[PDB]
Amino acid sequence: ACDYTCGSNCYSSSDVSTAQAAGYKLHEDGETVGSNSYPHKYNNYEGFDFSVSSPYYEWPILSSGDVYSGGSPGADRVVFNENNQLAGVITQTGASGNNFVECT
């Protein structure tokens, strides 16, 4: 289904799980990909009410269905924690500056 709506992008729960699984694996192997060194810390400056606990890590989710491998990140991110719990799916689309809004 279109479980999450990130601006004009639609993600299924399976899209979110595959993206999360890939970010976590890299987090746990101590490796990073891309210019922005993904997965990195998501600081929660927006102050979202994530049910799960901090430190939070952000990883790009691609609208194409491709899993992120170091290229252009895009607007959308999966946010997970240290226990691989999903905190949320966020996007820079619809937010001003370099801020994020939550995907609905």
By the criterion CB under 6 A, which residues form the site for ligand 2GP? 36, 42-46, 58, 77, 98-100
Tell me how far, at minimum, the Cβ of 94 lies from ligand 2GP, in Å. 13
CA distances, 64 to each of 31, 41, 47, 97 (Å): 23, 24, 29, 24
Rounded to the nearest whole angstrom, what is the least distance from the CB of residue 10 to ligand 2GP in the complex?
Answer: 20
Q: Which is nearer to ligand 2GP, 15 or 58 (CB)?
A: 58
In the complex with ligand 2GP, the residue whose CB is nearer, 1 or 43, is: 43
C-alpha dist (Å) from residue 21 to 40, 80, 85, 86, 101? 15, 10, 10, 10, 22
Q: How far is the CB of 8 from ligand 2GP (least distance, A)?
A: 18
Question: Strand 86-91 to strand 101-102: parallel, antiparallel, or no bridges (unpaired)?
Answer: antiparallel
